[model samples]
Target: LRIPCCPVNLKRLLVVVVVVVLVVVVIVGALLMGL
Candidate 1:
């Protein structure tokens, strides 16, 4: 089976995912710099 979202929601979801990934990268970078 397949499912999908409205284009607006899908774009929002993608933006949220990208933001979360950037946050994680920043956190990891800070930790590495601290070490």
Candidate 2:
């Protein structure tokens, strides 16, 4: 069953978003440093 984006689901989404952001930043940072 589909549920509303309440506290628990919202928090989980936030964790995923934060992880992606960290990975993106690290990759871009390393590329720039190599130049």
Q: Highest lDDT: which candidate?
A: 2
> Candidate 2, which segments miss by more than 4 Å at Cα?
1-6
Q: Clashes in each model (backbone N, CA, C under 3 Å)?
A: 0, 0
Kindly list the per-residue Cα lDDT of model 2 for residues 1-35, writing each as its tens digit.
Answer: 45555667778899999999999999999999993
Off by over 4 Å in 1: 1-6
TM-scores, all candidates, are 0.68, 0.62
* lDDT per residue as tens, model 1, 1-35: 23455566678899999999999999999999993
RMSD, every candidate, angstroms? 3.0, 3.2
Worst 10 residues of 2 by lDDT: 1-10
Instruction: Candidate 2: give the clashing pairs.
Output: none
